Amino acid sequence: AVKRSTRLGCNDCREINYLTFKNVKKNPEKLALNKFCSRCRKVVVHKEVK
Amino acid sequence: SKKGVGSTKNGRDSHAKRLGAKKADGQMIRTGQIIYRQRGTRVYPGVNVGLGSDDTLFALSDGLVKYQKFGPKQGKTRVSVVKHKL
Amino acid sequence: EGGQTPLYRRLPKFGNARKGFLKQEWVVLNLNKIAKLKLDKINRASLIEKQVISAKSQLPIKLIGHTKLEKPLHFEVHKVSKQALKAVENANGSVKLLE
Amino acid sequence: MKVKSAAKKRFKLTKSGQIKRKHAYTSHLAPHKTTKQKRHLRKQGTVSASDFKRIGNLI
RNA sequence: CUACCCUUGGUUGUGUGCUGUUCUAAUUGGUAACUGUUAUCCAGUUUCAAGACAGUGUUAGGUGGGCAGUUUGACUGGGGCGGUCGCCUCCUAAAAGGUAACGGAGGCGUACAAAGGUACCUUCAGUACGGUUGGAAAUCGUAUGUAGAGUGUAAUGGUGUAAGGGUGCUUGACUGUGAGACAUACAGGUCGAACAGGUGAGAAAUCAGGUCAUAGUGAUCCGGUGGUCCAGUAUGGAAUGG
RNA sequence: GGACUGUUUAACUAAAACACAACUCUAUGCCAAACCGUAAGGUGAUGUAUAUGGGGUGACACCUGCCCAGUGCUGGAAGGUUAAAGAAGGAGGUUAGCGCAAGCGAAGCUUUUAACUGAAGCCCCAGUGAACGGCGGCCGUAACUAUAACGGUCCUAAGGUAGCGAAAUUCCUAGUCGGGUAAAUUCCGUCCCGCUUGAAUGGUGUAACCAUCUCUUGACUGUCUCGGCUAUAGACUCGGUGAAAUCCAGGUACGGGUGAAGACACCCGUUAGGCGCAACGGGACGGAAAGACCCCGUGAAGCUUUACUGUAGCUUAAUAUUG
RNA sequence: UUGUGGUAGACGAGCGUUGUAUUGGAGUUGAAGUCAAAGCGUGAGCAUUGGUGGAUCCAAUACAAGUGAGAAUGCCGGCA
RNA sequence: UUCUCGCAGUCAGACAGUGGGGGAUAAGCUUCAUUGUCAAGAGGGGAAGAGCCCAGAUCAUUAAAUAAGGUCCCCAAAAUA
RNA sequence: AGGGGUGAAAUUCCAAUCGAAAUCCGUGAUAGCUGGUUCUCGUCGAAAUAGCUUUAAGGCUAGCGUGAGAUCACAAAUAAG
RNA sequence: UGUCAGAGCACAUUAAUGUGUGAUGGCGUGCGUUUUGAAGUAUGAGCCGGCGAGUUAUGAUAGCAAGCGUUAGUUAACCAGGAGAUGGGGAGCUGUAGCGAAAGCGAGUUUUAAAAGAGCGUUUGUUUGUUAUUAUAGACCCGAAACGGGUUGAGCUAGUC
RNA sequence: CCUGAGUAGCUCGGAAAACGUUAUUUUGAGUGAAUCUGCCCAGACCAUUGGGUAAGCCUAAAUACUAAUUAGUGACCGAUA
RNA sequence: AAUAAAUAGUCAAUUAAAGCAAUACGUGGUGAAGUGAAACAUCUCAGUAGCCACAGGAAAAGAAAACGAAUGUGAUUCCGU
């Protein structure tokens, strides 16, 4: 269908973390959130990776 | 006779999800087990009953399911769980 | 099954890179079964006369178990189990780890 | 007879029978399911009650 | 001046295959003569015509029902034409569930980083009244007003201090799980206590495992990307595999 | 209608079918094009453009019109696309060694794709009509009308030329009208709103001819009103021999009703001494072919095609032959 | 006490039949064979005798089966 | 009528009643739900009758009493007001 | 002399019938489709639904049957509240 | 179109309510097949008689029973012999540990940070004979036109010399 | 000094090897080596290590078969076999 | 002989089969379809069937650039695993 998926990766451990749905038709603005990370066992800021 | 005509768009029955009070009065039900399943509110939670976030009901504590009628003309229904302490 | 997709075909596959090889052959020795039999200085020369292994034996040894015994176990084996080590060493036997 | 090797590439022999398997929904994509049912998928599963006769005859 | 970047044209300038040539010795010839032989076969000696061509062989192409093997779904008040094939809501459906139809309706292949979560604040729509443009109907103030307002939307139910409108922080729109359960031919689908870590909001108790829910979706093969405490055909690697 | 002497699907149909000279278009200059087959070899052919092969119509008279939009064909060369193949390279890996590590990396070899050259062919442009093929609609328009000579407009590449036309072609339509005919859904002539006539899958006519089709008439009659007679060979008898198909068993009525839904057997009522002969046949859902009409089969077989995949074959190119 | 309708279908118990292996028995004073007859049995089955016949047969048990016929538009042959 | 196993048969059902849909509230019509029968199980009544009622049958017997149903004759038994 | 020929062409013909002769073998081909498939007795004893299926007269599971072993009173219905 | 009764008729036994026959009375739509359902005007069967369709080899599962057993048991093939049973011959097999993809660990293992939770396990037989079902092989039987290749064929017919 | 040269390889297609073309073996085309401190092999492949030394020929014996002869056997058939 | 020589060719002589068949097995080469896959186009029977060729009483492969991963075995072939 309308392929809208964007995969999320870590900034330091570079682990692939989550699949989210990003609204570029409204904003091309990049998003950097913080979520779980296993290799360091804590909440770390992750980004999107194309 | 037998000929093809325009469309009379479907009345095909969507898969009927089983709904209703899976548990009845007089039964001992522990924590976790669900009681009533609905998509569209008709019964309310009282105490000791948990609301799974699809308008679904389940038991929060061990006890017996019990009903209460109330509202503007006692048509509204709220469900709860009564305890039996030793 | 009368024209359906087979169950083993709708299931995911199990992958392994040991393909082109086989599992690692080793003869097992557990404390429970050897408790029935009486023998000391258990080696290659011991199991052949007890018919446990063949004359063409080439398989190395596991030692396995944590049960208790009152006999002086005497093994000369390639590897061991730590619980088995505790069990044999408490019994005042002999422990030889001969790879 | 012979043994259906293609089938047995997908099972894992277990003690006293009672074959197990992997939760089966993954070939092409999963950007439609919540992580809860994802980790339900991550668990290995077992065959149902009825399919024991349907699998044993293959063995 | 020092240079760089350009454009078109001219000089040769090194190589790239080429349609253009010369010669005959490869080679061709259903040119012609002679010996076998007196033989419309043939071979040899050759002449002539040519000729590095053609043809042959391999390869790569384009073309090629001439031919070869196959296919040309199902459902159905006969068949074909028509229409339909997945999932969601209402009625049918006999106040439990479930209940057919080539039954009537509607729909869909979603959107949202906020329209969520948190903490706080706040409420009908509408009627009438009086009020600069301002008229059926703009918005202000007041009372009236029990839902006819909104509910991200197709529908259903509920949602009157709310799941709605606004304000501040944030992306729990977590990880590993998971007792217990619902419905269940398989596939499967659905919730969820609770534990442990990490958090966030809130003073905190508490809440946050996405949206008020019911739809927004396809098994499996195959190939790929990132990471990986996995293996490495004697070994060490490596490739590749997991 | 066919021109015609002509040919045929033995054993359903014989001709308006086929052939047919004649004409038409195209291709072919020798070891020819073309054909058989794998190939020698052979035909065409011991042929040589007044010749051959293929295609089309089908005496003859007079004509065959518009369009190359698309495809088919032919040519062309600027331009874009285009395989294989040749190879300026690229990075990775082993580590001799350099290396405290961290790593770097000689040479050899492997991995793998690329700068560039790169045929035919496709797109391109012209021609191509007795090729495949087709040849439109609307609106307005004329001092009686009606109509459309005409013009404009939308699209196409082009909007049917001539001719004929209710006919082997026309649903409407048993069109109108005329005659024919006592009495005309048939006949023909005739007017042309021809759903779509229509020019080489020809058009209009064409004398003879056709076991051709159709209509009328003359004679002619048992075709008919309208049936009868005679003689034969049986069928009838006697004599010689002497089958066949079919068959669960039959001591095998009628009416009504029921019934697997149409009765010789069922139920209810009526009727018939036993056994034959000549017979003609109502039925026994008569006999004779697991129904060919019809459905299904994930049947088969055959047929066609721009359905899929390939091949025979044709054509273009690199290579060894090959200087 | 329940019992005993019964389709496909399932469970259960048996009979006969050909040969082999044994302990036995009979046989021109007529075996197996055949048909006839006023039998036996819960069933597959078992008989008694006569006549024709002229030579091997039968009881009990164990084994193995080309081991049980109304149908197949059945076949073969024959008679209707 | 739960648990494990073997063997199954089995997806072309029909009829009667009750409620609907289509149909035309027409249908020995079609399709769903419910109660019974036949199929899969014979019989007495309905004049016979596949589904209706009474009903559920080991065999034999020259027993009786009933069910539905019936009692003018066939054809079993009835009369009284 | 037959993925052939022949042919004044219609599927003409090919040893009395051919959309590609007759025969050999492959082959005991295949056919979700019919027809049939042989001793007795005892007992229990069905369905004809749902879902899926290039599936619709083929198949698979659940369901409803049976045999054996069970669980065997917190299990199952039959009455009432 | 026979049964149940029944005269009547004629004889006299596997000693048996004797046998044989039956004027009449009561009753009464064949056999299978497919099937919702066939008495059927659905299908097939003239008939007698012969014959005529569940097996083999391997193997799995399950059942019954037996043997064996607490490291058992089982020998294949092969050699020896009455081509016999059998003897020799463990070569392998089931089991005593499984878990995980694996390294590896081990009554623990897998995920995980987790020896948290969860899943598996927390020993439960061997070899035979028989039976039932079943997969490979034409594997109940009979049946399709067909398809492939190889042969016989132009003297019918067609044509040609 | 020698020990088998259009050879092994290499490129494009192939087959077999239990493999769907993959180490290995074979070739259809082109290409094309090395000489003892040599080569190749060790399922791509390098280094180390180890194995054995192609591009020459032949070879019994176990193992296959029974139309024929001889003898015998048979829970083989007994004239629709 | 062409062509002088020599060859081609011709003439004369010696040696072996050529052939058939044990209706089977050995090898080499050519080399199917049908069927299954519930269709079918990869596969599948199968390198089977069939055809061609040379022989034998057997024939073929055969003496390590072998297998392969072990301080390994040491022609080829056959049988169970």
Curated annotation (Swiss-Prot), chain A:
Keyword Ribosomal protein: yes
Alphabetized UniProt keyword annotations: Ribonucleoprotein, Ribosomal protein
Keyword RNA-binding annotated: no
Molecular functions (GO terms): structural constituent of ribosome
Record-linked SUPFAM superfamilies: Zn-binding ribosomal proteins
PROSITE patterns cross-referenced by the UniProt entry: RIBOSOMAL_L33 (PS00582)
InterPro entries associated with the record: Ribosomal_bL33, Ribosomal_bL33_CS, Ribosomal_bL33_sf, Ribosomal_zn-bd
Any Gene Ontology CC annotation: ribosome
GO biological process terms held by the UniProt record: translation
Family the entry assigns: Belongs to the bacterial ribosomal protein bL33 family.
HAMAP family (UniProt xref): Ribosomal_bL33 (MF_00294)
Protein name as annotated: Large ribosomal subunit protein bL33A
Organism: Mycoplasma pneumoniae (strain ATCC 29342 / M129 / Subtype 1)
Annotated gene: rpmG1
From Swiss-Prot, chain B:
Post-translational modification, as annotated: The N-terminus is cleaved by ribosomal processing cysteine protease Prp.
One MF annotation (Gene Ontology) recorded for this entry: structural constituent of ribosome
Keyword NADP: no
UniProt entry keywords in alphabetical sequence: Ribonucleoprotein, Ribosomal protein
UniProt GO cellular component terms: cytosolic large ribosomal subunit
Membrane spanning stretches: none
GO biological process, one term: translation
Similarity comment text for this entry: Belongs to the bacterial ribosomal protein bL27 family.
Record-given protein name: Large ribosomal subunit protein bL27
Native source species: Mycoplasma pneumoniae (strain ATCC 29342 / M129 / Subtype 1) (Mycoplasmoides pneumoniae)
Gene (UniProt): rpmA
From Swiss-Prot, chain C:
UniProt GO BP: translation
Alphabetical UniProt keywords: Ribonucleoprotein, Ribosomal protein, RNA-binding, rRNA-binding
GO CC terms: cytosolic large ribosomal subunit
Superkingdom of source: Bacteria
Molecular-function GO terms, alphabetical: rRNA binding; structural constituent of ribosome
Subunit structure: Part of the 50S ribosomal subunit.
Family according to the record: Belongs to the universal ribosomal protein uL15 family.
Function comment: Binds to the 23S rRNA.
Protein name: Large ribosomal subunit protein uL15
UniProt organism field: Mycoplasma pneumoniae (strain ATCC 29342 / M129 / Subtype 1)
From Swiss-Prot, chain D:
Keyword Iron: no
Classification via InterPro entries: Ribosomal_bL35 (IPR001706), Ribosomal_bL35-like (IPR021137), Ribosomal_bL35_CS (IPR018265), Ribosomal_bL35_sf (IPR037229)
A Pfam family recorded for this sequence: Ribosomal_L35p
Region (Disordered): 1-22, 30-49
Coiled-coil residue spans: none
Signal peptide segment: none
Domain of life of the organism encoding this protein: Bacteria
Gene Ontology cellular component terms for the protein in this record: cytosolic large ribosomal subunit
Molecular-function annotations in GO: structural constituent of ribosome
Keywords, sorted A to Z: Ribonucleoprotein, Ribosomal protein
A GO biological process held by the record: translation
Annotated Basic residues bias: 30-43
UniProt-listed PANTHER family: 54S RIBOSOMAL PROTEIN BL35M, LARGE RIBOSOMAL SUBUNIT PROTEIN BL35M
NCBIfam families documented for this protein: rpmI_bact
Family: Belongs to the bacterial ribosomal protein bL35 family.
Name of the featured protein: Large ribosomal subunit protein bL35
Species per Swiss-Prot/TrEMBL record: Mycoplasma pneumoniae (strain ATCC 29342 / M129 / Subtype 1) (Mycoplasmoides pneumoniae)
Lineage of the organism: Bacteria, Bacillati, Mycoplasmatota, Mycoplasmoidales, Mycoplasmoidaceae
